[PDB]
Design goal:
This protein is mostly helical and about 500 residues long. It contains 29 helices and no strands. The longest helix is centred in the last third of the chain and has 23 residues. The structure holds a DNA duplex (17 and 17 nucleotides). It is classed as dna binding protein/dna.
Length: about 500
DNA sequence: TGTCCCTTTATCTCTCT
DNA sequence: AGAGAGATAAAGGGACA
């Protein structure tokens, strides 16, 4: 019989009990732990079920699942219960930060290393705990933290990096690799190719940073004489997750895309300069003719869909859904292109297909409003949130649907919608802001932290902002959100 | 196999004017 | 508003006990 049979059965037995108290895990959650944490993780969750959710730690199920669904999740679980008290009291971290550290492959290692190295990294190297956390909050955090301790001096002193830059580089998967690669390649990339430290840091500061730097060093000469590319364009291709793949694919497919489809190199760089550029390019080479056939979509329109993270996913999904969205849902081809020309355009298209008739019929929105909500990064999130929150926001909070749509129609709109519903009463009732003012603050990218900034200043006032009126603070918050308020604080000082 | 670490891709959010 | 950066997650491979 098949070997994995016993283990699979074990998985399913134990899994069925976790649908019960104190955890109440759904199928989605249970499957997730099985795939990544394995069977030992699922058994550990059950084993530790009461101990985790109850006092002391008082973790939510989500947090328990977040910790459990990685390699070694059994180990992270045992360690969290051991070290969350220690790190919260002896180092002053919040439980959320502890969970974040725990929620990665080898979580036990990161947590233990943070427990061992946080004092030395703050006292002798002047890092903040938040910086120590960020370094530790990726696979191999243990490696990254140790490598930061070893190399912060020689990176700041012998190579001229600020600690901020070193932290930025370190704070990715394989962080240890990017650090070590920057020690070796920084002089070479700067002195031989005239790259700034800043540019090298941008290349280094992604997952697989080491891979992109070495590939930059290799392909920069070939790309800058044989293809008409500037260093700046190369840097932009490489300064993304999997920049190595993106670069090799730009050498491969630039001439092909140009000659065969009439694209400019500028258009090719744009496609390559997003996470998964390789995937986007190869998908363009294969789908552009298909999309453009019979006076269909223009090239320009295809290039735009391609020119976002996961543009491959966006492209393929357009090709599948362009017919059904236009025919059965009444959307113009131009509208479909707009929904898809953002990160996660695939997700947004699928969510418009699913939710457009519902939001129109059940909530009284127009397809134009639905398109506008969808036409941002995380559009799926904004659309799903409008569906959930329109009734409470309108009925209980006084908002017009037109205002709810305005809040949802920016990157992170789901975050803004949730924050308005959460902070509108205290902001209006307890401090005399008008709803229109709250909506105005929230109808911008970064709507959430802008609203949180305001509530903070009105509930635990910084003197540094006391000269500003509520209306001025509002005017500021609409202008530049949280950053603007924070900048204004620094100025007073 | 369980655990740790690294790399690529996709998606979501906030910044920076 | 569009480009850049950072965050969070899913999934696969190498490594080794």
């Amino acid at each position: 019989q098949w070997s994995g049979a016993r283990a699979l059965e074990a998985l399913l037995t134990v899994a069925g009990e976790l649908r019960g108290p104190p955890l109440q895990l759904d199928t989605g959650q249970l499957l997730k732990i099985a795939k990544r944490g394995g069977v030992t993780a699922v058994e550990a969750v059950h084993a530790w079920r009461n101990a985790l959710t109850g006092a002391p730690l008082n973790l939510t199920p989500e947090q328990v699942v977040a910790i459990a669904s990685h390699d070694g999740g059994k180990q992270a679980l045992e360690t969290v219960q051991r070290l969350l008290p220690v790190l919260c009291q002896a180092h002053g971290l919040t439980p959320q930060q502890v969970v974040a550290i725990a929620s990665h492959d080898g979580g036990k290692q990161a947590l233990e290393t943070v427990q061992r190295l946080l004092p030395v990294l703050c006292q002798a190297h002047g890092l903040t705990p938040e910086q120590v956390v960020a370094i530790a909050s990726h696979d191999g955090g243990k490696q990254a933290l140790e490598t930061v301790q070893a190399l912060l001096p020689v990176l700041c002193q012998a190579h001229g990096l600020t600690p901020e830059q070193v932290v930025a580089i370190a704070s990715n998967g394989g962080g240890k690799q990017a650090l070590e690669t920057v020690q070796r390649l920084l002089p070479v990339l700067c002195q031989a190719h005239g790259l700034t430290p800043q540019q090298v840091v941008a290349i280094a500061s992604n997952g697989g940073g080491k891979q992109a730097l070495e590939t930059v060093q290799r392909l920069l000469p070939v790309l800058c004489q044989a293809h008409g590319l500037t260093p700046q364009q190369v840097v932009a291709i490489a300064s993304n997750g999997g920049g190595k793949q993106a670069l090799e694919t730009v050498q491969r497919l630039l001439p092909v895309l140009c000659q065969a489809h009439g694209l400019t190199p500028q258009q090719v760089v744009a496609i390559a300069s997003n996470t998964g550029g390789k995937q986007a390019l190869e998908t363009v080479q294969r789908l552009l003719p298909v999309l453009c056939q019979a006076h269909g979509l223009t090239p320009q329109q295809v290039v735009a869909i391609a020119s976002n993270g996961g543009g491959k996913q966006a492209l393929e999904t357009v090709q599948r859904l362009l017919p059904v969205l236009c025919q059965a849902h009444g959307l113009t081809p131009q509208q479909v292109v707009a929904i898809a020309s953002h990160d996660g355009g695939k997700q947004a298209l699928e969510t418009v297909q699913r939710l457009l008739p519902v939001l129109c019929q059940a909530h009284g929105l127009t397809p134009e409003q639905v398109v506008a909500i969808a036409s941002n990064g995380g559009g799926k999130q904004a659309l799903e949130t409008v569906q959930r929150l329109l009734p409470v926001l309108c009925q209980a909070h006084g908002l017009t649907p037109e205002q709810v749509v305005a809040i949802a129609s920016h990157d992170g709109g789901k975050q803004a919608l949730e924050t308005v519903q959460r902070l509108l009463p205290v902001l209006c009732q307890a401090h005399g802001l008008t709803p229109q003012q709250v909506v105005a603050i929230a109808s911008n990218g970064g709507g959430r932290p802008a609203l949180e900034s305001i509530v903070a200043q009105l509930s635990r006032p910084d003197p540094a902002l006391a000269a500003l009126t509520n209306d001025h603070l509002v005017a500021l918050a609409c202008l530049g959100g949280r950053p603007a308020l924070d900048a204004v604080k620094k100025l007073e000082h």
